Amino acid sequence: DNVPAHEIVSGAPAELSRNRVVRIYQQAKPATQSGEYGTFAWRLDWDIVDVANRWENDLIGWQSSGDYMQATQMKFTSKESAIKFANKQGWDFYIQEPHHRKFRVKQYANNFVHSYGKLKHIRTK
Amino acid sequence: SSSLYRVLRNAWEVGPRSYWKQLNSIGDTKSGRLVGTDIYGNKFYETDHQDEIHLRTRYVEYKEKDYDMSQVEPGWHFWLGYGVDTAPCNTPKEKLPIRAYPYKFQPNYTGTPGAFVTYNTLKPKISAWEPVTKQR
Amino acid sequence: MNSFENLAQDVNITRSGKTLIAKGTGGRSSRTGYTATVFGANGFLGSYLTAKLAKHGTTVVVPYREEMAKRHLKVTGDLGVVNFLEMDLRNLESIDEAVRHSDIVVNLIGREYETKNFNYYDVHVEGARRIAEAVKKHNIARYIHVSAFNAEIDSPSEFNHTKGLGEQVTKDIVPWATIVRPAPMFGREDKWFLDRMARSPCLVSANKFQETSNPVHVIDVAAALERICFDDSTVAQTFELYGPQKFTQKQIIDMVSETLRKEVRHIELPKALYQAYTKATQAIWWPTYSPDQVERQFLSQKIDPSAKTFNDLDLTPMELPDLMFKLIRPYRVN
Amino acid sequence: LPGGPVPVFKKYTVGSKGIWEKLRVLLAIAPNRSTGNPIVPLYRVPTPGSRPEANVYQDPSSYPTNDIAENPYWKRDHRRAYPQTAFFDQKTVTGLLELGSEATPRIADGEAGTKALANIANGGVSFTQALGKSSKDVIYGEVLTVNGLPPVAPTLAPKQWKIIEGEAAIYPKGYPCRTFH
Amino acid sequence: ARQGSFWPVTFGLACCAVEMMHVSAPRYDQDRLGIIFRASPRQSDIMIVAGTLTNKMAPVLRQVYDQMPEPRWVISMGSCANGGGYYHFSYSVVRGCDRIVPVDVYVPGCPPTSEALMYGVFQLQRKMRNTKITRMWYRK
Amino acid sequence: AIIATAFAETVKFSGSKQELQKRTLALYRQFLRGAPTFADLYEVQFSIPTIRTKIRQEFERHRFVDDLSIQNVLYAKGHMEYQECINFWKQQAQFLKYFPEEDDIQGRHQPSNFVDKFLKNRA
Amino acid sequence: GEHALRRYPSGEERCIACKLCEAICPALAITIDAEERIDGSRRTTKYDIDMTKCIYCGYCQESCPVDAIVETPNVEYATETREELLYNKEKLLANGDKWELELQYALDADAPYR
Amino acid sequence: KSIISYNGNTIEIPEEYTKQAPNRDSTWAPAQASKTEIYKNNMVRFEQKDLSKQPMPYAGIELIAQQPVRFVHGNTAVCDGANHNGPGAQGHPKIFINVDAPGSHACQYCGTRYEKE
Amino acid sequence: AVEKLLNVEVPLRGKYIRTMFGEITRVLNHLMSVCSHAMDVGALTPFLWGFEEREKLMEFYERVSGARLHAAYVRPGGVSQDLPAGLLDDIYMWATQFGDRLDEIEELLTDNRIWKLRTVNIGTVTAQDALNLGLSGPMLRGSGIPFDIRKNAPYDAYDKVDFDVPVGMNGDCYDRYLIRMAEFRQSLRIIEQCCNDMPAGAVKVEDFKINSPPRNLMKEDMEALIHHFLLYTKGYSVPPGETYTAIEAPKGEMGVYVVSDGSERPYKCKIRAPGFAHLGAFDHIARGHFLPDAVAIIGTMDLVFGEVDR
Amino acid sequence: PSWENIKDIRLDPKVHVDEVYEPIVNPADRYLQHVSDLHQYAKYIMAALPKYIQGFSVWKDELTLHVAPSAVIPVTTFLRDNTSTQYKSIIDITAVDYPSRENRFEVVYNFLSVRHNSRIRLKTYATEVTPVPSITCLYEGANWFEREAYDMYGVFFEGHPDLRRIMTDYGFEGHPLRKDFPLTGYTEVRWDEEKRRVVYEPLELTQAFRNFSAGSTAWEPVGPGRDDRPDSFKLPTPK
């Protein structure tokens, strides 16, 4: 199922496959934009490490880091491919299943439906 | 031109004191008309002697013994590099920067106590709690 | 990932009430939060101590005298870790500037001969007194004062006498200082030890090369110093850092000859003649064997019965026979 | 012969004047060679920071691209009319062999055509069987050339070389370096 | 004497070595100041680190630095040698030669013009000119 | 032509495990034989028995790898390493990477239980 | 050559923390922080250039929509330690103030070509 | 003048160098570190250093606050901060400012203040 | 490569500028290679004479781009900025005397019998082995094969200008030296032609979705400001695909294999450096020679080692 | 007749145009007939080696042949050696890491035919454990390119006489051009004063790598394009 340690032929540090957890997901539809072009690929990136994520240099005020994977992120065409890759490397992962908008029928004419009782609210346009 | 006659003629044109000054600073003997003077005190010359090759027709005589290219005032630095035709003193008022602050020229201070000390211009990102006790 | 091997924990509180929070894993770009002034940092032991300190990014203030001698120390730390301060023992304001911002002050200032400007007293007692006064006035959290083994007040040797007086004045001024007494230190490019035995024209002893001391590796002394720096339980204690086994000078010379595949020349001279020779050569400007060094050639190492040792720092000294080949390799010829 | 020697007074380099000129011409290996020093009043003057053309420069543009009244951007939007990459697998080359091509069809109409396309796209015919059934006309016209020869590796712009000999060459006859045009 | 006989070891690694050659070209003529580039480190005063320092080259650079007789100075030329430069985040590049050898003057640029390198040389000579040698011994 | 260099072996993936173990044991023997040469070349402080111990550990690490292709790759990389060492292509700096244990003690605090790891934020 | 941050004739800074210079810089030399100034303006509170990462490519100067960051013709600023080569906001503004006249020469000469 | 350090010791700084700028005493942005704090945190690197040589450029907030308000007839003031003397585009992008509200309205790019009269 | 992926066209003036400056670049590179070669064998003087010409041309670089060496001037779509006002005259003025500057180096080198002793029949390479080893440029034209990408795959304005291609016959260091020396002359010819035929118009492609708009539009026009913002923050998106595009670089065939995934950042970029293939062929060429012949061979391969390892 | 009277070029009358006319043309149009020719040529090649050629693709002037790893030696020999092809020059060899595929790497060969003035590209695939047959027996130049491909990616080349790292440091672990290898590597070096030698340490950056790829566009930027396939290579529609 999962490649153990020390028969990975990549040469990466053992710590990568021992005490690091990656996460696989699809990017969420950004709330700020209506475009959806970034949401189809399956990203893979590493969960952060507490001590080594980022600190502030005491000279010019920069963001120092000891985590060599903080900037790395792979793109895959499909969830199964990402799973296969992570398994072949021996990475512990978690899958975050995507959420989608539930379909509902929208009619422009619905803005002008006659109301037989009291108006619940004044639509304004 | 490397000729000895050039050196003799320049020395005669310039005078013995200036010849010794040039031999003790630049090592050549240059004769040219003064153009202007910095805020720092250096003096800038241009020459039209035909025996002078391209890129040797403008030069500077530093004011101090411990001369340094960083002591050339900006604007003169550009002129001395053949950046512009017209020297800073000869430039119209329209093409001069307007300043709302006093202008101060400071050369390169490296190797001195005046060297630049860098620092972070921001206070820390996360502000800690000021501890206060309350009585039960 | 790296690790702050010198630190016990992450948050630290100095005796002066400063809160120090180590940032980072513990490598070059990290910072322990401590600041240390190392007097005599450009010397034989100071270089190793400074390298170990700046390896983990504790700010090291290095007071120096000659600009060109201290340049190798800048390589040991990240940008802004190793800071250089011009200093002189006869300029009090300079000492004040050196110690003002530190949580740790260690001084290694000691000279094995006398100069036209600093005699043994001036360098070991008044110098230590001035440094300790700056420490006491600025209430520095930790002060480490390094003396020499066999430091005794009423010694025959002016070196040991002034060293004992320096210890006494340090204890009088700063009651919480830590006193370290290392044995003869060897190592790469040591002073008046292995390297001298390896390239001397002839070693001349006034006492048959009979003297015994427990030589100790300089790296081990520096590591012990670091440990003393970062644990607050060594305050007001005395440490006698010395090597595992006791050697005779002749034994060390025999070991050096065996490892060098070459015979070291030994010549034995009367004590008076060698005194006169050393006193005569003290007239040249470069350091040379002292008269008081040959006086010390009649003193064997004396270990205080009641003194903390390497064991109390959970350290184990390396063996001089083991390092020999590593420490003198460029002279084998072969 | 164009590119031949031009005299030293048509080169923008300082040179010599007076008696020294005659001395130079007497003592020069080739009298028409310049000295390498640019002429100070002529060269790089006026300086780049004081060109008069700076105060007249306007951004350059070309018709019809700069027109304000007849160019819709989508008519000249070449980035998004880019040619797709055409991938042909063995099934597609099969289909081409049997059913012919859009340019010259060899397919029947109605359901027959669609079912032929289907069973080739399913794997009914292999490529080797395709080639075997293939007649002489189709092999010669549509795999080899009409003469039956294989096609030569295509070239976008054929280059016809010519060798320049004699006075127009770079080197004279002896040297082991020839001039191709 | 130290300023008048300024002998570097050439140690040229990349695009900065070209501006280092143009210093010696006729227009600037480093030789007119007394600068002779000498191939052996034994006969050299100054090391000029002119180029990207890789991890594969770091031991060799430190070795050539160690084999220069004293007194010795080092000038770091170019962004790549100063701070790792345009390859600062590469997996095989040392982020600055001052990780390896002590450095006296940093010349900024990519590549520093020949005039900037000459200015850095003048800075090194100014540092030499203010050095106490026997006066320092007198202070001892 | 461009001819192979010293101790170069053409890349060949063994079709059978046994034919691979033959080569593997040959390579191990080569490493053990070369140990003194490595000790001379790289001016190491430590002893030849320690070199040989390190080699044995390296070969031990992959003693239970099953799939043949992975074994082939590991053997090829091991041979590339051997050729790198024996030809003095490597320097002392990269050679001592193999030997992290013989360096001295790095410090007083190498945490082992949860409380010491927690105190240093490494829990 | 070396970098400098410009002002308006009124002496108000020109940099409005749009951070395009930060985004285009091929060496990731530039570090910028910003927030609402007390008078409501959008200004920088930290603007650093690591002069030892910079490749002196001049993209930062082509990018800025208000000509705030520019590259002076100055090449003579060699230093004796590396910490002087980490320019903060104060240093870059000081350079702008010091070199404004030469900057105006270069701008008057080349602005039609940008 | 006297800043107490984390050590508990005193750091003495001349009054002129505690001002954030030559013309302004206090910070002009919440995240901006004050000179007092700068020294308190970096005093090791400021020892034996000459403060009068450090950059200290002028605070532009006050300089723009000294510029008089421009009065405009209509509802919209147009500003582009151009340099009428030199060639090319040397200003900031041309924007239009509404001045119907009471008071002065600042240009978003240059800070020049406009008002409807 | 990027324009081929982008399916855009460089304006005419831009093409001509790129040809002129490609040949100024060829002249600079050959000055460095030939003079460094002669310095390796021992001829120290052409180094300095040719370095003054290098200085003169780096003046032109600095005037059009602002940097002496790393111009960053030629960009996908054209060139970054139009030529300054007084550049064509200065280039022509330099071109009137470069011919003599070449003749002097040739006086010292072409007929000197010591030069021919160091170069004749040294580093001989056969035509077939040249093709087999992947050699290109002079290293291939020296062996008798007339192949030149400027003539074979006419790129830029290499079809609007007239020039010849020198081809050796013995494939030794001396033939390659002759080839380089004649490429000097051909480059001077091309530079003159472009000085005489430089047209008017734009220098970068006139679609502000690829190249940024002029600053006078960017500060007045909304669309231009948006496009400027996006180009310098996100970048233009290249249609997906891949390409291998090679040119006749001064050192031989230089090519890039770029893989585009439809995004703003390349998916893969491999550079084919001619020096890599040459240094690979070193062990075949240099076998059986003397150590000084190895020095001369390295000289004739004309290696830079930024190319070799990237 | 001398340089003091040489005529001033700077005052000569320059040419002046009023309006510049540059017609709008799609640059792909110039390749249409050549694309047809490449199609015909690729058809011939597939018909000639149906046992080997899994497919081809044509884009403007670049033809690609897709083959399985076992087919490389025969197809390369046919290319190098057939009279109508004669692809004598190896140009480059490389790999491209596709982590979505089962076979990660795709190995690319570019060939050049100086005889015919034509180029061709040949692709195969491989994995981190399955090798590709080396073509050094056919093209001498491929030696170094295959050492580079192995070094960067890890792809093995069966039959390569001397396959070892060419670029990375001695004793480097990892194949840098793999999409899972981080930008900055895992280790860095410095000079260690205690050990007097250059030591390797875990990576620790003073400023962390800021990846600005998060700001990629949220709108599809280009679209589908257009197909330049010749009508002689599109399947016919019934009726």
Ligand SMILES: NC(=O)C1=CN([C@@H]2O[C@H](COP(=O)(O)OP(=O)(O)OC[C@H]3O[C@@H](n4cnc5c(N)ncnc54)[C@H](OP(=O)(O)O)[C@@H]3O)[C@@H](O)[C@H]2O)C=CC1
């Ligand atoms: N090495 C040994 O065998 C033993 C040494 N020790 C002690 O170890 C400490 C250092 O050992 P080591 O490092 O070998 O000694 P070093 O001589 O190697 O370094 C000693 C330091 O003392 C400084 N120093 C001496 N006199 C003065 C002064 N008057 N003013 C300022 N600085 C001065 C030197 O600075 P500069 O370089 O500027 O002169 C040097 O940095 C000394 O205290 C020594 O007594 C004790 C027992 C054994």
Ligand code: SF4
């Ligand atoms: S600093 Fe720039 S010019 Fe110098 S070597 Fe590095 S990349 Fe090349």
Ligand code: SF4
């Ligand atoms: S010159 Fe280039 S590297 Fe330097 S700040 Fe500007 S864009 Fe960044």
Ligand code: SF4
């Ligand atoms: S691009 Fe210009 S205006 Fe924008 S943040 Fe950078 S310097 Fe300021």
Ligand SMILES: [Zn+2]
């Ligand atoms: Zn405005």
